[PDB]
Amino acid sequence: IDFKDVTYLTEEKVYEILELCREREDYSPLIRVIGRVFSSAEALVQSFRKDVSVDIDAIRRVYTRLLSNEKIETAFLNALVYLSPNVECDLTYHNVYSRDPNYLNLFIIVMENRNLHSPEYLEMALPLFCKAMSKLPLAAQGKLIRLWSKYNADQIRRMMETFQQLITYKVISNEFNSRNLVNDDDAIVAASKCLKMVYYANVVGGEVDTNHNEEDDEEPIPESSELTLQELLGEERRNKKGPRVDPLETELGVKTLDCRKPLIPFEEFINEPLNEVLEMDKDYTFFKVETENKFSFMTCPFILNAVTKNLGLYYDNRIRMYSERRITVLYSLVQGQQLNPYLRLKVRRDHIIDDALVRLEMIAMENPADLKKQLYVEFEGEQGVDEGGVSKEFFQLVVEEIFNPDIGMFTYDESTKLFWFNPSSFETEGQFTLIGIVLGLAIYNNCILDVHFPMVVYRKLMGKKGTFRDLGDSHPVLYQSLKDLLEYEGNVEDDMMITFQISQTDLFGNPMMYDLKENGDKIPITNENRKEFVNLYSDYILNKSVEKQFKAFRRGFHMVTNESPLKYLFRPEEIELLICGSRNLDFQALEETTEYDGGYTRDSVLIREFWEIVHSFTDEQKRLFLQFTTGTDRAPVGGLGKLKMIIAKNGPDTERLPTSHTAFNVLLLPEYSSKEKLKERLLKAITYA
Template identity: 55%
Template sequence: MSSSDNSAADEASSNKEASPCPQVIHTEEGDMKRAAAKKLIERYFYQLTEGCGNPNCTNKDCASSGQFNPMNPNDAAGHALKLFSKDAKLCERHPSKIARIYCGCSKDKFSAPEEPICSVVSNDNVVSQTSVPTHLTEEALYDIIDECESNETYSPLIRTLGEVFSSIENLSKSFSQEPFSATSTPNSENPEKLQCLNKEQLRHLEGEKDKDEDSCAETSKTSIRPVDLPAVRRAYTALFKLKTSIFENAMVNALVTLAGNLQMELPIRKEKDSHDDIVNVLLIVFEIPALGSGDFLETALPAICRAAQWLPVEVQATLATSWAGPGRSSIRNILENLQQLITLRVIVTPFHREFFIQDENVITSATQVMKVLYYANVLAGVLESPALRNMDDMNDSMDESFLAVKLNKSVAPVDSLAQTLGVHILDCRKPFLPYSEFYNEPLSDMVEMDRDFANFKSEFGIFSGKFSFMNYPFILTPATKTMGLYFDNRIRMYSERRISILQAVTGQPSNPYLRLKVRRENIIDDALVELEMIAMENPNDLKKQLVVEFEGEQGIDEGGVSKEFFQLVIEEIFNPDYAMFTVQSETQMMWFNPTSFESTAQFNLIGIVLGLAIYNNIILAVNFPMVLYRKLMGRKGSFEDLLDWNPVLYNSLKQLLEYTEPDLEEVFLQTFRISYKDVFGSVINYDLKEKGDKIPVTQENKYEFVDLYADFLLNKSVEKQFKAFYKGFQMVVDESPLDQLFRPEEIELLICGSKNFDFDELENSTEYDGGYTNDSQVIKDFWSVVHALSTEDKRKLLQFTTGSDRVPIGGLSRLKLVIAKNGQDSDRLPTAHTCFNVLLLPEYSSKEKLKDRLVKAINYSKGFGML
């Protein structure tokens, strides 16, 4: 059987029509073995392409019949599967029509003997018989390449690649770390097992034959050895020094055949079956250097990804572990290949209202493979102890009423792959590759998040059969994930609004919004008192849409009033006069004051404010260290978190750890007693261990000292304040998919906004109305003035036009600023609708006048009026 024919025969298993095949094996022919099923399908394929050899054949599904319409190999492969599922008539084969192979050195076809033979014509025109190996080693590949180059024919190489890379069994044994046992080598003295290891003729399907084959398959599975990945890479380096055109077609066809075999094999394997061969196959395939280019990218890689989506979670975990260990140097190359495949399909596929990006099987299957690589990237990075996860401790601190509310909420599904690996994203201090390299921007821009969110929230989630990229958030940019969070929050707001309306119908008092009425000069007391009452009476009211009203002002809150409300609250909360937070002088980072006199209720309410900001899609001007966001996600602070919060202390402790001389005790003069200052500047001593002032820090206990020191500063000393803060935060976001979609650094971006202060982006995304265009002279003058402003004045301009001086996640292009004409030249100042990001700009007669009016407007405007 030719390599190309075999490819066509098995290719159908990578199509949607292949799915019935595993079911037929179980339901219609329960006793039929997998090997026999495959051979039967191949017989149907030969019947459709070659015929039975009987010129008087009356079978309409046989090429020898006069009623038969010729088929190409691909159509024949698909039709062979259908005939197999229907248990259709199978002709008796003509004696001459036995299983055949194709030798790359000529177009002739040869009968398949017990061992594949390839005819090679040497320079002396003497025909020699060269045995084709059933599996490859590094040395064997070198020998074949040398032989081909010396004979000036690459037929043996082409034939070998086709034979090895099209077979799960052959490829899984290739490039093994250890030699195979005698029972599985080509030189074995046991002919029965030797025949099972090689591809046989299609001639019989007797039960005893199947039994022998299954017995042999079990023997071969036990002989699978781990792949020697360095040898694989060296072998590929030698192979791809040749012109790719020599072997590309044969290798691509073989990989498509291999993918078909995988897609047929994986769904019918039992859980107890060994999958070492599958892992070996995938490790070898994904090492191919050219997998992300040419026909490999367009044909082979999609087929492999479609097959890999059938991998059981245990096999995914094994594959991830292998990539994280000896395969880690290939993580970047594999990721780039998958990214290229996804990007290519996003660009070339004509999506429409009946066919969305979530329906494109190549994209979704490649994303599933990327998830395995994502966890490999985590495992290959710097991991911390799982003991630092503290969700149980946090839940223990909640009062019974709050826990009762949480028990009624939907629980996020457990990531089965992470659970099998025993790892959590929060365990990874530093991944092998930056997380940002897993973002795919073309895909993120193309995803329609309304549909994706609907799939994500479908009744049975991932088990509904509906694909959602929100279940694979590593591939989405933070800006796109924010849209998913926005939909979730808005739907919850509308749900609370409907409940309020129903209550009103039944005569109960109701309020569809979370209304806060505050005085600008007394904003903290007014806001916190109202929020405290709401949190005590009905925490679910916090999930209603926020509407803020400043007493004595006419502004109607469509978003802009809320933005200023949060900004003013944050300014007051972090006022040093309250002494609820301390500021690190080197980094200007805010942290909980362990000696604060404020009650836990105050910290609880600050957590509510932070949660409300996320829930209402408002960016805050806060400057917390990253450890706060890690703690909000359920991870305790540790030594490495000190770098971001207090780099001076971190470097001092690091010097202690790196000091290796035996006189550490005399040099550092440090004991297990530490000191810190309270709000009045008084020094407070604290023993990290009992009688800590009597225990010197030595080479033996220095790591314990550093861990205890960091644990005290980041966890124990602020435990009361943080637990209250965390409780308030969870009152708002407990039902949100926040922790499913975002990592700690993305949470910071969500709360604080982007640091990319690029006004060129804002200019390019701005729209014009009322008669202005980007060619209007006043618009040209406006941007000339704006680009010349200081950074501080640019922030004031953002505050004036949008109600916030922060850059939204995704950059300034996300603001969608609108500049509208507001009459002819006059002495009026520019005005703005902050709720809708609209700047009303008169058509000033000169650039100087425009600058003067604009600067005055952004510096002296405060409060809201009816515009």
């Protein structure tokens, strides 16, 4: 048999060839047919036929036999190298997919190879194939993702690991720097674009809930100058389409915000070796302006860790801050006004809330664009140019005063150590806008706050209402009191006489009785509506009870973060790490990245005698030291290594305590005589403050 007149393969028609070739000693015709049909796209489209036209099981079972012999595997390795460059050029100019949807049958056959994970494919087979699958149209990609969403956890993990190791290998082997950018590489970009496919397969395959969305964000009205210019241009009747949304999120119709529990934890898609070679200043520009052949990794934010994503948001905020400096210069030149490039805030120490409220609410009406200037807070009666020192002090002061239980805005739970909105307080809508603005101004001006909220608060800020499953952190006792109701195996309408009307204690101590439906006490709880009572009790507790308090809080947060990519890069889980910081205090990293000036060197007598005192500080004394030098008790995103502390020499051995310049994280350390004297002054400096 010549076997030179075949153009496609099925399960039985390759099984018979294997059976007939087993009795001989050649095994060569199988290699020839594998290298002839699997190297041609037109052969693979019609191969293994039965929205897909290839049977997965037939492909799975044939591969379990062909990859038994070592030489047969090498045919598969070589077939991919010959096939992919054809498909890459075929999908770029020939416009093949629209002609026949069966072209996608090519990639499913390849992606089911068991040895794609093996290190032998990382050289030339996989990188070229990812180039072919990176050029698929949005229509093919959307339906390809849907088939992958039906896989279980192990299959998705294998598929993700295939493209992850290619990304690490192309970065480990090569050397990328500020002159050899990662973006222009044609292998990592194609592998990252291919990793996005399995990412959305993981999103869709998990628990997806779409209909539980909040109200649309109240878009702020631009200044009167921009409104007037719109009427002249005749485009005053149509609005902007909105935030930049991934084009793959539109074809599928499912966003990452909907996915509650994915098949795989979202932190597993982060490629740490990629992050350590990424220049986020150049990556942001490729995100804004479309450059020739540079691919911005901010278009695939799932691959960046918290530190790298925090840098991308930082550059977007700073560039918007610079644009407000150019406009103020233009106003003084052309219009002859006074140069005011700052969001200047004059507040008193005893009236932080009242002063910051009458100033920020005024700006939110007259000049809504002033909130995007650099913050410059100065306290009344005190003189000083604020480089960041006073902003850090003000951010700590307003947060520690807003969350005071006496103010009545937030309730404190001493068990879980989290704050929740207080629905009892009324006529305090204006303050809820202030705390929303302050959170937005903290992200914008890059200062971390000491704010303790349940994860539901950061989910409602992003637009997702709190469901029953989110009650485990907000109201821990009500969660188990309601979980037991569903878990009860016996009858529910007789053992306890709970009706559809609830009771809630208030500040006045009068338990008000609330009816979920029209009448609660007139309707008992039955097993048929056992799940219904939970779905309305949780909805009222998280959403309906605090609707007015959270509407103002969300409105203020949106006035400062509407044009930022915050909704694009950060999931609700990662918002908390951005507003607040990490509580872990790795003082070894602080020592590693500390710089010295004024005469001190890394191996000075006092500097070496200084790091032996802080390393012996207890947990409480490590917190006091950071509050003295940084202005915050917490560590920035990442760790203390990102906190480039500086120790500066301050004159001879004195009885004066050390002083700190918290704007630049500078500790001014006199050259004390001994180690014991250094400890006494250091302890006295951080405790009194």
